[PDB]
Amino acid sequence: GFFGPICEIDIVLNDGETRKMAEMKTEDGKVEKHYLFYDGESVSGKVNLAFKQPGKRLEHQGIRIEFVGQIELFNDKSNTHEFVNLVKELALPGELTQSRSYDFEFMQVEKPYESYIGANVRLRYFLKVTIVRRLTDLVKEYDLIVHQLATYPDVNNSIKMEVGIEDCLHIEFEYNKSKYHLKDVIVGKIYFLLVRIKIQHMELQLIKKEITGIGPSTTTETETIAKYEIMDGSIPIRLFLAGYDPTPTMRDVNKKFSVRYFLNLVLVDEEDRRYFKQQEIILWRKAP
């Protein structure tokens, strides 16, 4: 809110009217809406600097606009990795005396990673206007969201996961895929191969792990996205992802950040003993 009464910085995209706005659920329980972009698309528009009152001035050492793709870690070192930064100088040192607008166009912009808002990390893209000044610079950011579309073979090669303790409990879970899209469905069955104990309560879990930092600084957030009970006392299984709106798997993004999903089979007996097994599955976003 610096110099609000004097002037306003407004950033406007040339093609906003026909460009969709994606939503991103932040943890604060809020919902952000920003224009959706894809890798390779051009980013162009205008920067409007409008004076509200007459006879006012703003001395500066230059004005520019940057397109920024950033991975920001929320640790004590505030580790930030800018994987993309395009700059366009808009004005040389001088002073703003009257409302002015500047056109800009970043062409065929590389946006290699999908946007992400996590617990200890966020990967975001944004336009940033900076008016350099002797004291604090005036800055205006304009957030954009980037989705990454993919396509896989979609083969039907089942997968097997085994749980238990030898000569006590042996369970097998066979599901149809290694990879699923955000609205896909997981299909499989839990075969019992030996039950020397009393199966009190068991369930299939869809677990999310967000890994940040590296070395002695490696942080990990684990969240359960879905529980598929089967408790009770050869049981088919069908789990619909659409109902949870997960985010895609993000792996080859950066040495300091990954998001992976895992299927977790948990079995507990009357004696309260826990038998578990975990296997990773890859979630991806399918083109319309």
Side-chain angles (χ1 to χ4, degrees):
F2 301 158
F3 302 106
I6 299 179
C7 100
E8 194 76 63
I9 304 183
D10 279 296
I11 304 182
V12 181
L13 295 182
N14 290 160
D15 66 15
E17 286 300 301
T18 47
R19 180 178 291 283
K20 190 165 189 178
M21 281 193 79
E23 299 193 57
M24 288 201 97
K25 188 61 180 182
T26 177
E27 288 188 301
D28 324 302
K30 315 178 179 184
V31 52
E32 296 175 50
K33 283 185 178 182
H34 306 296
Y35 285 115
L36 176 55
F37 275 79
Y38 293 92
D39 183 10
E41 288 191 301
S42 275
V43 190
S44 62
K46 297 178 175 181
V47 170
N48 300 324
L49 301 187
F51 273 106
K52 293 182 175 182
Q53 309 173 59
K56 296 302 178 282
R57 67 183 280 283
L58 206 74
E59 184 170 295
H60 65 261
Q61 298 78 57
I63 304 177
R64 48 169 172 174
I65 180 167
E66 306 166 57
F67 175 82
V68 188
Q70 234 170 50
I71 289 181
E72 188 187 318
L73 293 190
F74 302 156
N75 42 37
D76 257 306
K77 294 184 173 184
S78 298
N79 219 157
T80 302
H81 174 66
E82 275 181 5
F83 54 88
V84 171
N85 183 310
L86 306 178
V87 187
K88 157 67 172 177
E89 298 298 319
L90 300 180
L92 295 174
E95 61 163 40
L96 292 168
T97 302
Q98 309 181 303
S99 297
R100 184 163 184 170
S101 56
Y102 317 74
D103 293 314
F104 68 82
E105 59 165 352
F106 294 103
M107 294 180 87
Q108 308 172 296
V109 181
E110 285 210 56
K111 304 179 213 72
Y113 312 124
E114 180 164 312
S115 292
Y116 178 73
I117 296 180
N120 317 302
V121 59
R122 66 168 174 170
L123 185 161
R124 57 193 287 242
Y125 291 87
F126 57 95
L127 285 166
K128 174 167 60 168
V129 172
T130 298
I131 298 185
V132 181
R133 305 188 320 130
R134 65 176 186 175
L135 296 184
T136 295
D137 296 341
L138 302 190
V139 174
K140 185 68 168 63
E141 296 184 8
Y142 187 85
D143 297 300
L144 302 177
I145 287 166
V146 168
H147 275 4
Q148 193 184 75
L149 308 183
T151 291
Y152 287 73
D154 307 303
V155 187
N156 308 304
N157 269 182
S158 68
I159 309 188
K160 300 177 181 182
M161 167 190 274
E162 299 177 292
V163 207
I165 290 300
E166 301 87 301
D167 185 46
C168 234
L169 178 71
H170 188 170
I171 286 180
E172 188 164 306
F173 175 47
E174 182 180 48
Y175 47 100
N176 65 301
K177 303 188 174 191
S178 215
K179 319 192 176 190
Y180 299 81
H181 58 261
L182 310 190
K183 300 185 181 175
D184 210 321
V185 52
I186 303 175
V187 182
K189 296 194 176 181
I190 296 181
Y191 302 68
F192 299 74
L193 307 181
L194 175 65
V195 185
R196 290 298 198 66
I197 198 166
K198 50 282 187 174
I199 296 184
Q200 185 183 310
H201 169 53
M202 73 180 270
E203 55 178 42
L204 178 61
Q205 298 169 172
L206 175 55
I207 281 178
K208 179 183 171 192
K209 285 187 195 174
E210 165 199 296
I211 301 181
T212 59
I214 192 172
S217 188
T218 305
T219 285
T220 306
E221 201 81 16
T222 303
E223 185 192 316
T224 293
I225 294 180
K227 296 180 184 176
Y228 192 74
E229 296 191 310
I230 316 166
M231 1 76 99
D232 303 304
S234 50
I235 302 181
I237 287 182
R238 302 210 74 177
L239 176 51
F240 296 73
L241 296 176
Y244 303 85
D245 188 48
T247 90
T249 284
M250 296 165 179
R251 294 188 115 304
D252 317 297
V253 178
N254 177 71
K255 294 180 180 176
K256 289 199 283 278
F257 152 62
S258 49
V259 177
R260 303 162 198 163
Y261 295 83
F262 301 77
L263 288 188
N264 199 49
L265 262 181
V266 185
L267 319 170
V268 191
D269 59 45
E270 282 178 51
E271 300 178 57
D272 303 303
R273 283 178 294 198
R274 202 164 172 284
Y275 310 74
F276 64 83
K277 195 66 172 178
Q278 186 177 84
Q279 288 202 298
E280 167 176 21
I281 59 165
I282 297 184
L283 306 188
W284 55 281
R285 171 181 274 82
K286 188 229 288 290

